[PDB]
Structure 1
């Protein structure tokens, strides 16, 4: 795979891709 900058909507789309049915958390303040 690769390392890229993933920000905002794109970061959460990526989380959705990788986690799917497992679910995920997006916690930018943490």
Structure 2
């Protein structure tokens, strides 16, 4: 794999690919 630069919705797409059926938590800073 290569390192990536991921902003906004594009990070949630990556997480979705990586975690799949396992699900994930999207927790931005406030």
Same fold (TM > 0.5): yes
Give the structure-1-normalised TM-score: 0.84
Unaligned runs of 5+ in 1: none
Aligned residues: 30
Q: More strand per residue: 1 or 2?
A: 1
Give the structure-2-normalised TM-score: 0.84
Give the 4+ runs in structure 1 shifted more than 2 A. none
